[PDB]
């Protein structure tokens, strides 16, 4: 009697439900797990706050307009002010984690539009200027707000080119990364489970973003006649298997 469409995800003291899912992607066919001794370098003991950080945090909502270009969030950056997770993220020299990303967008059997929801490991952004100019720290560290692609470009910030994935590659090939679609006629949500992917066992959570969640309208939003021309897009994210180390005084970052 059960369906691939109705699902529940319980993580800590938060439970999410969807009645219009389209399965879910488990990046590179790998589920998150803690760091093993064989892989460990750092001799320190890791802190595992569990259910206090491994729960769902909901980001500030977005508004899908018929002219929308897309949005980009960088992790662990987007969750740096989220309760005890953000705290831990700034008291330790190193951390490690995976996530459960849940993107939401409900509509009407009269609407049509399609979103591409993708997770890109190491999304090194291109600068507005080009040349040898780098994208300033604060521009890749927007926090919860993320990068709104239809915002005017500034000096030292990224390009606002969805067509070029903000990195010099083409949009259509973004399908090589773990992704999922939100096709209104079908979908309601998109869920992606992300394991820890990095060339080092553990890392600094502030000077390096391991991934950037990208939500990009492909098929323009087309609402029924007399209906409101927009739809909100909500992103809920839960850290899973989080570990922290190198505890000390509060990390000091720019701003």
């Amino acid at each position: 009697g059960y369906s691939d469409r109705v699902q529940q995800i319980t993580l800590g003291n938060s439970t999410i439900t969807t009645q219009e899912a389209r399965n879910a992607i488990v990046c590179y066919a790998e589920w998150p797990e803690y760091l093993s001794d064989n892989d460990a370098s750092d001799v320190n003991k890791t802190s595992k706050p569990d259910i206090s950080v491994c729960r769902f945090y909901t980001l500030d909502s977005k508004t899908w307009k018929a002219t929308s270009k897309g949005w980009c969030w960088k992790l662990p950056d987007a969750l740096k002010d989220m309760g005890v997770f953000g705290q831990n993220m700034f008291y330790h020299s190193l951390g490690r984690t995976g996530y459960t990303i849940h993107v939401q967008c409900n509509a009407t059997k009269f609407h049509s539009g399609c979103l591409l929801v993708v997770v890109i490991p190491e999304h090194q952004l291109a600068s507005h200027e080009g040349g040898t100019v780098s994208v300033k720290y604060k521009y890749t560290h927007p926090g919860d707000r993320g990068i709104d692609l239809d915002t005017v470009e500034v000096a030292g910030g990224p390009t606002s080119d969805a067509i070029y994935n903000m990195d010099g590659t083409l949009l259509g090939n973004l399908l090589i990364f773990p992704h999922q679609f939100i096709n209104m006629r079908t979908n309601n949500t998109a869920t992606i489970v992300v394991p820890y992917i990095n060339s080092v066992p553990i890392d600094s959570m502030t000077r390096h973003n391991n991934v950037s969640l990208m939500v990009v309208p492909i098929a323009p939003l087309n609402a029924p006649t007399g209906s409101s021309p927009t739809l909100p897009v909500t992103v809920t994210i839960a850290p899973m298997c989080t570990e922290f180390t190198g505890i000390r005084s509060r990390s000091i970052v720019p701003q």
Binding site: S3, D4, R5, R22, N23, A24, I25, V26, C27, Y28, A29, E30, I176, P178, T186, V193
Partner: protein
């Protein structure tokens, strides 16, 4: 054909063989619930 290593360091050796452990699935079907070709993609 034959090959014997003339050097002490592993880096010195020639090319490694063919992997023969291809598995496009991690990239083509990284879905949580298994989907079977022929059955309803979504039920």
């Amino acid at each position: 054909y034959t090959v014997i290593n003339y050097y002490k360091d592993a880096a010195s050796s020639s090319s490694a063989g063919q992997s023969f452990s291809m598995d496009p699935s991690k990239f083509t079907e990284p879905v949580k619930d298994l989907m079977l070709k022929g059955a309803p993609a979504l039920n």
